[PDB]
Nucleic acid binder design. Structure first.
Ligand SMILES: [Mg+2]
Ligand SMILES: [Mg+2]
Ligand SMILES: [Mg+2]
Ligand SMILES: [Mg+2]
Ligand SMILES: [Mg+2]
Ligand SMILES: [Mg+2]
Ligand SMILES: [Mg+2]
Ligand SMILES: [Mg+2]
Ligand SMILES: [Mg+2]
Ligand SMILES: [Mg+2]
Ligand SMILES: [Mg+2]
Ligand SMILES: [Mg+2]
Ligand SMILES: [Mg+2]
Ligand SMILES: [Mg+2]
Ligand SMILES: [Mg+2]
Ligand SMILES: [Mg+2]
Ligand SMILES: [Mg+2]
Ligand SMILES: [Mg+2]
Ligand SMILES: [Mg+2]
Ligand SMILES: [Mg+2]
Ligand SMILES: [Mg+2]
Ligand SMILES: [Mg+2]
Ligand SMILES: [Mg+2]
Ligand SMILES: [Mg+2]
Ligand SMILES: [Mg+2]
Ligand SMILES: [Mg+2]
Ligand SMILES: [Mg+2]
Ligand SMILES: [Mg+2]
Ligand SMILES: [Mg+2]
Ligand SMILES: [Mg+2]
Ligand SMILES: [Mg+2]
Ligand SMILES: [Mg+2]
Ligand SMILES: [Mg+2]
Ligand SMILES: [Mg+2]
Ligand SMILES: [Mg+2]
Ligand SMILES: [Mg+2]
Ligand SMILES: [Mg+2]
Ligand SMILES: [Mg+2]
Ligand SMILES: [Mg+2]
Ligand SMILES: [Mg+2]
Ligand SMILES: [Mg+2]
Ligand SMILES: [Mg+2]
Ligand SMILES: [Mg+2]
Ligand SMILES: [Mg+2]
Ligand SMILES: [Mg+2]
Ligand SMILES: [Mg+2]
Ligand SMILES: [Mg+2]
Ligand SMILES: [Mg+2]
Ligand SMILES: [Mg+2]
Ligand SMILES: [Mg+2]
Ligand SMILES: [Mg+2]
Ligand SMILES: [Mg+2]
Ligand SMILES: [Mg+2]
Ligand SMILES: [Mg+2]
Ligand SMILES: [Mg+2]
Ligand SMILES: [Mg+2]
Ligand SMILES: [Mg+2]
Ligand SMILES: [Mg+2]
Ligand SMILES: [Mg+2]
Ligand SMILES: [Mg+2]
Ligand SMILES: [Mg+2]
Ligand SMILES: [Mg+2]
Ligand SMILES: [Mg+2]
Ligand SMILES: [Mg+2]
Ligand SMILES: [Mg+2]
Ligand SMILES: [Mg+2]
Ligand SMILES: [Mg+2]
Ligand SMILES: [Mg+2]
Ligand SMILES: [Mg+2]
Ligand SMILES: [Mg+2]
Ligand SMILES: [Mg+2]
Ligand SMILES: [Mg+2]
Ligand SMILES: [Mg+2]
Ligand SMILES: [Mg+2]
Ligand SMILES: [Mg+2]
Ligand SMILES: [Mg+2]
Ligand SMILES: [Mg+2]
Ligand SMILES: [Mg+2]
Ligand SMILES: [Mg+2]
Ligand SMILES: [Zn+2]
Lengths: 174, 204, 140, 16, 37
RNA sequence: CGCUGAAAGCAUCUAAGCGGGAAGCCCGCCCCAAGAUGAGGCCUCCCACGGCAGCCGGUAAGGACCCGGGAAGACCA
RNA sequence: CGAUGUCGGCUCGUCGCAUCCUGGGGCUGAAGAAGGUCCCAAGGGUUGGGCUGUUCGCCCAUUAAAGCGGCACGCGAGCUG
């Protein structure tokens, strides 16, 4: 019933050195940095990284779980990476890859091209499944939200761009 | 952002593709670079220009020494184009070619002490139905005790014109390099023989 | 006996590194210094204080959400000419005016008052041009 | 807009 | 979004939160969505 | 409307942080403007004149008066 | 009360926003179009007539829309009467 105390499994070889207000995390698939509150303490154990809180008042209790799960996600990013899949639904609808960019054909009049930032790399298996890959969890999560937003899952029909595992809830029409 | 000094000469219309295009003609070229404004010494970027040769008699001493340091003979007008640094040291009409698009700045025709109907497109008073000596008069100018005063900037009568006016996005119709003529479809501020400036347009 | 009033004295130049100090609390000591009340011979009716040179007025600091919520204002005299620009925007464009405005409202109103304002010289950035007077650095 | 019509308090000025 | 001075839970899935100094009621049922004002 | 996310093992747009988002706000356009007494900047011109931080003169570069005028204008400019 | 000229009109506007339109949104018993309703927003716009002194109101023909109010029911050392 608490996340600030659950220590962080650090696989090998992940490099989690600590700085005042920073925690650097070098991994096999890249490096990330974590801004950590200067009131929290990050600790380096044998293959484990642990975070301690300086008190038990609300803010130090709130910062605690955060600056853990933050340093957690950075270890799982540089090592085994983060992905997110987008299914496409709608008769005319389809998406393709133009070099290192993504061109959606989602029923406007133009087609829409997304540009993957630094870190994000697109990939399209089928013409109806897009995949966003990157070591940053938050950044992967933005891009996927970004892309999906272009044609959010409609209300009445099974048309739009859907999150992996998105419930297909609709409403009657007549 | 290129400019040139010039003088408005007079209006006409020509025929281009069986359409009548009313133009005004501007004796633009040529304008010798008299001074260059550089950030190191001045702060911004611009070129001082020159127009209309002048009697070296008429040009006084401090002015003369200025002209000379640049190598220019005395000229009647100095004006600066801002954010302009041409490669040569003399500007001609050929920095514009037809199809371009210009902003033109002159001094408007001065209407002196103009009324409130001429200056502000007011509507005065009735000319019958008992209207009494107020046919060209503005109307009410304020309220009553609250605020008990007159808004700053209130539109009243006064001088109108003989002010700077810039007109935007004017089609360059044709350029006559030999006679230093610049054609521009539309209305340019000021009278014929009035000094004007022709820069590239701000619009797009 | 009558109270001593002083002949015109040589004024003192004074330096402050306004960095990381609180706006109103530094503003209040710069006012005292400009008024020259730190002086045993203080006379109310003449500029006798100091010349206060300030640097890093851009790196001044302030509590609360005042950055987004301290709104400075100007009235042009015209209909609708009340303009309201918050603190952060001020620092973005004219940051010396922040501290400058603060000292001003803590100075007196009247002639001498705004003449004392002229004896302040606030500078954004680390440096100042007043090396000629060689201002004594005060840690306030 | 004042619904109840408001009677003049002063006469139209006349020479005295 | 319903705006009112009485934000209340409507169903058992309605949730009360305070984001940006204002009381909300978020829920999966979009009618139940509320703000205070 | 979100991403990431604890307090609160779940959830939460927020408590740390990052997005998206109005004819609206700030720039940007046109015009006035250093009497901005905080009176700015640059280019050029004159320059140590005679006498008992002041005065009296003659001058310098310049300016003004006066005149011909002007799509400038009430006079002034 | 040894005077604070009083409806409506004209003229000139200026502000408020409890927004008529234009812009941005959530919810809809929102298929689309089109509406309903609440939130943000005062930048700009908000027609011409018939009747009556009329403000208001009805009506005609349009409209993106034909907003509501404050300013001594703004405005008679500005006009009307
Ligand atoms: Mg002619
Ligand atoms: Mg031709
Ligand atoms: Mg000119
Ligand atoms: Mg003129
Ligand atoms: Mg005239
Ligand atoms: Mg006219
Ligand atoms: Mg006019
Ligand atoms: Mg007219
Ligand atoms: Mg009229
Ligand atoms: Mg008329
Ligand atoms: Mg009329
Ligand atoms: Mg009469
Ligand atoms: Mg008459
Ligand atoms: Mg009259
Ligand atoms: Mg009038
Ligand atoms: Mg008043
Ligand atoms: Mg004039
Ligand atoms: Mg104009
Ligand atoms: Mg055009
Ligand atoms: Mg004193
Ligand atoms: Mg003093
Ligand atoms: Mg007082
Ligand atoms: Mg009488
Ligand atoms: Mg709502
Ligand atoms: Mg209720
Ligand atoms: Mg929920
Ligand atoms: Mg969600
Ligand atoms: Mg979680
Ligand atoms: Mg979430
Ligand atoms: Mg926050
Ligand atoms: Mg943002
Ligand atoms: Mg988004
Ligand atoms: Mg933005
Ligand atoms: Mg527009
Ligand atoms: Mg100017
Ligand atoms: Mg000056
Ligand atoms: Mg000037
Ligand atoms: Mg001032
Ligand atoms: Mg002074
Ligand atoms: Mg001075
Ligand atoms: Mg000076
Ligand atoms: Mg000067
Ligand atoms: Mg300067
Ligand atoms: Mg004259
Ligand atoms: Mg004359
Ligand atoms: Mg005269
Ligand atoms: Mg004269
Ligand atoms: Mg009375
Ligand atoms: Mg009296
Ligand atoms: Mg009387
Ligand atoms: Mg009286
Ligand atoms: Mg009435
Ligand atoms: Mg509102
Ligand atoms: Mg809309
Ligand atoms: Mg609307
Ligand atoms: Mg239907
Ligand atoms: Mg619809
Ligand atoms: Mg709606
Ligand atoms: Mg508006
Ligand atoms: Mg009508
Ligand atoms: Mg009739
Ligand atoms: Mg009528
Ligand atoms: Mg009527
Ligand atoms: Mg009626
Ligand atoms: Mg409509
Ligand atoms: Mg309609
Ligand atoms: Mg009203
Ligand atoms: Mg009104
Ligand atoms: Mg009232
Ligand atoms: Mg009254
Ligand atoms: Mg009235
Ligand atoms: Mg009046
Ligand atoms: Mg009246
Ligand atoms: Mg009268
Ligand atoms: Mg009246
Ligand atoms: Mg009156
Ligand atoms: Mg009166
Ligand atoms: Mg009568
Ligand atoms: Mg009569
Ligand atoms: Zn619910």
């Amino acid at each position: 019933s608490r996340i600030g105390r659950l220590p962080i499994p650090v696989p090998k070889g992940v490099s989690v050195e600590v700085a005042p207000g920073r925690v650097k995390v070098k991994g096999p698939k890249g490096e990330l940095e974590v801004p950590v509150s200067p009131e929290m303490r990050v600790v380096v154990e044998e293959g484990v990284v642990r975070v301690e809180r300086p008190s038990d008042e609300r803010r130090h209790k709130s910062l605690h779980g955060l600056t853990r799960t933050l340093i957690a996600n950075a270890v799982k990013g540089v090592s085994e990476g983060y992905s997110k899949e987008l299914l496409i639904k709608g008769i005319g609808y389809r998406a393709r890859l133009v070099g290192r960019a993504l061109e959606l054909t989602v029923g406007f009049s133009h087609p829409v091209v997304v540009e993957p930032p630094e870190g994000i790399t697109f990939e399209v298996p089928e013409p109806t499944r897009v995949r966003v890959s990157g070591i940053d969890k938050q950044k992967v999560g933005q891009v996927a939200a970004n892309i999906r937003a272009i044609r959010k899952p409609s209300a009445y029909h099974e048309k739009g761009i859907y999150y992996a595992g998105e419930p297909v809830r609709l409403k009657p029409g007549k | 952002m290129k400019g040139i000094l010039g003088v408005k000469v007079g209006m006409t219309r020509i025929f281009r593709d069986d359409r009548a295009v009313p133009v005004t003609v501007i004796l633009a070229g040529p304008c010798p670079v008299v001074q260059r404004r550089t950030p190191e010494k001045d702060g911004y970027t611009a070129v001082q220009l020159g127009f209309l040769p002048q009697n070296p008699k008429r040009v006084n001493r401090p002015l003369k020494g200025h002209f000379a340091k640049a190598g220019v003979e005395p000229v009647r007008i100095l004006r600066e184009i801002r954010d302009f640094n041409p490669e040569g040291d003399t500007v001609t009409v050929e920095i514009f070619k037809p199809g371009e698009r210009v902003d033109v700045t002159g001094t408007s025709k001065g209407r002196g002490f103009a009324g409130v109907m001429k200056r502000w497109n007011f509507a005065g008073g009735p000319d019958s139905h008992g209207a009494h000596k107020i046919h060209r008069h503005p109307g009410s100018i304020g309220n009553r005790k609250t605020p008990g005063r007159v808004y700053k900037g209130k539109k009243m009568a006064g001088h109108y014109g003989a002010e700077r006016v810039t007109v935007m996005n004017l089609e360059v119709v044709d350029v006559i390099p030999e006679e230093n003529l610049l054609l521009v479809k539309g209305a340019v501020p000021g009278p014929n023989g009035g000094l004007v400036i022709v820069r590239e347009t701000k619009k797009a | 006996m009558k109270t001593y009033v002083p002949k015109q004295v040589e004024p003192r130049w004074v330096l402050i590194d306004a960095e990381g100090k609180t706006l109103g609390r530094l503003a209040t000591k710069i006012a005292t210094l400009l008024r020259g009340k730190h002086r045993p011979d203080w006379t109310p009716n003449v500029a006798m204080g100091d010349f206060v040179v300030v640097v890093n007025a851009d790196k001044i600091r302030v509590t609360g959400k005042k950055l987004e919520q301290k709104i400075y204002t100007r009235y042009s005299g015209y209909p609708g000419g009340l303009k309201k620009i918050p603190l952060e925007k001020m620092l973005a464009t004219h940051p010396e005016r922040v501290l400058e405005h603060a000292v001003k409202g803590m100075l007196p109103k009247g002639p001498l008052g705004r003449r004392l304002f002229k004896r302040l010289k606030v500078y954004a950035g680390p440096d100042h041009p007043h090396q000629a007077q060689r201002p004594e650095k005060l840690e306030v | 807009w004042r619904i109840r019509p408001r009677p003049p308090r002063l006469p139209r000025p006349r020479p005295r | 979004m319903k705006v009112r001075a009485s934000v209340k839970r409507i169903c058992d899935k309605c949730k009360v939160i305070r984001r940006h100094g204002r009381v909300y009621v978020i829920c999966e049922n979009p009618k139940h969505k509320q703000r205070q004002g």
